[PDB]
């Protein structure tokens, strides 16, 4: 049908004239740091990428993309599923069932970490974080599993997608551009391309578009793929607003523009000035590198004898005729060096590398004083804080849905939500701290006055551990007092009759021969 | 912190559990009064101990009691060996041992 | 001094340590060289592409070729592999919950603390799985 | 390669002067061609029947450009793999390699789309080495006039 | 043979390659068990006692 | 209600009785305005420094028709004291502004 917005190949073309501000920023912004990261895409093989004269942008990007990956995504359990605790108390008989629910929540949070690591999501997120530094603005598509086989996720680094969003935060429509070759197309698309007509080469590429527009009269998204034809008839997906496999990530958020900025465009002016110094210092060393022999032409020394002489010949002439053209700028090389060492000093804090070689340095700064490296962690804490909303939560809310449909996860009952805690964490340390406070009460087990039954509740109240699996309740002890007794009942009892039977089993020796026959032993002993 | 500090002050009173003169029932209240922890879940009240003195006794009552009859039954359950075969049938054991 | 500055900014790009080619002049000592971990993190960005390209297809071929020559048992269609840099997570999360349970050792005679539950909470906080973790109902 | 027993089985590599792959702007591989230069006495047994089957005697040490072709199949997602000589095939050829498990895997330092091959890591500083040699060439030559 | 390979005037590239190829080999491929096989844990609970 | 409304306006340093609040870093915005005007000048002093001008003494012998076209190590006519380079001055002034 007309499908209320048309056409998807032209929605990409109307809004391609909106990437061109951000795209020509990133082509400039990758030129100074690392040119292989975001090409101009009027680029082929060959177009060799000249290294920038400065190597701080190449340094301070890998040292910032990895320190985001190490901080956003540690190897352990970076998400956790909080059940709403008061609504968990109502629907359940306390207290054993409550932690039994949290074992099912500890079940799921390990399966996702066994799903993320076993599908190389760590790879394509690190390729995402390098795009988020240089350009921002990457959407990565999480396809349906269709089995327990290998399932990566494809990203699109702003030269292959288009989104359009509001001045308000929500997304209106997305267009992604593939260039899948004809032999490599999926099966339903090859029926549509052949259904369009005309034979194709095995290696000819096809601009395959998607269109993920927000629906008329319903809050969910509609998603249809297309070719040069209208649709592909495997198209329509009813993606809800909160769970769509296409999520556009965003380095630093700015309203109400459609895309996001990047982090390293906020220092791209400063790299532009630091390369212009480092271009000049190197070129001053190249005039230096040339060795010109200035012969004083009012002198005696002809170098017709200086060249053709051997290892140690005696030659005519004065030494003060032969001087060499040397590069001047002794007091000028230090001006351009001390500024370039000051600009690298104030970019090395902007990026998360430590203070390092590029000074005298001269540390004596020792030894507990380098806890001010935590100032780099706090400055790092301001960097990804936007990104934990934009990437880190929608990547879980998609995988909580897609694993329900493929039955690789239990259907969690509509009430559990997740924070991206940088990981408990709070459940471990608050349990570990109240143990040591209760361990100080160990010499008070014989004190007749202190209510140790209450102090252990007060520390469990001061430290915010919950309660009610925390202490033995009213009944709960007559069972426990019996178990020490039933132990000593079974212990003294089994030691009684075994001494009781075997003493009288072998006395008045005819009974000893009768006792051995019951086991089946003949008269051996 | 106010709970953690009053523990260490009460922990210094540990070698005074046998001193017949110092009112350790009062010093633990004074430190609970000096440090602003509240009170009244803080100490064992008047009754509160005859229950507690019974629980050490009911423990030793259940412990020595369960060790008595288990030594008491099983000694006389297997003597004059016809009683031993009768005792194994009550569990359901035939003549295996 | 330029050639000592270009070698200085290639020696961080490659994973060798800062070295001879200056005055050097370390006094930089002794716990301060934990910033050599910055070279490991820069190294962590290098092979991260390569673990998808080399390190996973080399296993998925050998998981097939050893089935055909019967040098491996036919694993039942549901096991997949990460290239964890190696457990690892199974060892450290087991080693950490032992030391937390070892602090509960002077509480074996305390009549109030539910030690049957605290050992489950630490097994719940640390993401060790459960159910081989504790003695069940009969079991005693 | 396939084991064919518990004997010694290394793996052969090809450092870009002995293979050719062609892949899409999309990540997947379309076709691969590997070039061997196996000598005539050192050829495998089925290939010697094809070279003699082509005709003409060969020297014991003459090399033969032995090609493979690992193209993605028409109408099926698996790969097809056939070896060849100057002749058409070798009749020990056809292997139904699946998409996820093929013994020929092309490795790739830093990935760039949608070019067929990958770049290298040390070409990202090859300009800077080019400037650092031009200094170190001059310092040494200043010591030789010295 | 012969075409003798002249050494570059600088020896950082010869240094920084072996010191980077080995530190990839030591990090990608340690001597112990660098892969492991994860079974899908919830589907392992269903098919098993 | 007055005490519970979902729209709450936050306020860095409170000042009465104006409708809005000030900001913290406007209390040093004058000082940043002076510190950029120094750091703008130090960088621009390094850019005159960056340009490499070869001042040939025109009362001398050295013609650079031989200085350019010479090879790696040629013997050329001339005195070294003719070729000097236009360098940025301000040795005792760069330290004042630094």
Residue numbers in the entry:
A (entry chain E): 6 to 427, 434 to 536
B (entry chain D): 440 to 536
C (entry chain F): 343 to 427, 434 to 488
D (entry chain F): 148 to 293
E (entry chain F): 50 to 98
F (entry chain D): 245 to 342
The authors write:
Another two independent local reconstructions focused on the portal and tail, respectively, yield the structures of the portal and tail at the same resolution of 3.8 Å, suggesting that the portal interacts firmly with the tail. The T7 portal, which exhibits a canonical 12-fold phage portal structure, is formed by 12 copies of the 536-residue portal protein gp8 arranged around a central tunnel. Each gp8 can be divided into five domains of clip (294–334), stem (335–356 and 269–293), wing (1–268, 357–427), crown (428–492), and C-terminal helical barrel. The tunnel is 140 Å in height and of variable tunnel diameter. The narrowest channel is approximately 22 Å in diameter and is formed by a so-called tunnel loop and a long kinked α-helix (α10) in the wing. An extra rim of the top opening, which is formed by 12 C-terminal α-helices (α14) and loops, interacts with the core. A rod-like density that is approximately 20 Å in diameter and lining the middle of the portal and core channel could be assigned to dsDNA; this is similar to the rod-like density observed in the P22 portal. The dsDNA is embraced by the 12 tunnel loops in the portal, which have a weaker density probably due to its asymmetric interaction with the dsDNA groove.
Escherichia coli bacteriophage T7, a member of Podoviridae, has been used as a model for understanding the DNA packaging mechanism common to tailed phages and related dsDNA viruses. The phages package genomic dsDNA into a round procapsid using the portal in complex with an ATP-dependent terminase complex as the motor. At the beginning of phage infection, the tail is responsible for receptor recognition, and the portal and tail act as a tunnel for DNA delivery into the host cytoplasm. Here, we determined structures of the DNA packaging intermediate and mature capsids of T7 using cryo-electron microscopy (cryo-EM) and symmetry-mismatch reconstruction.
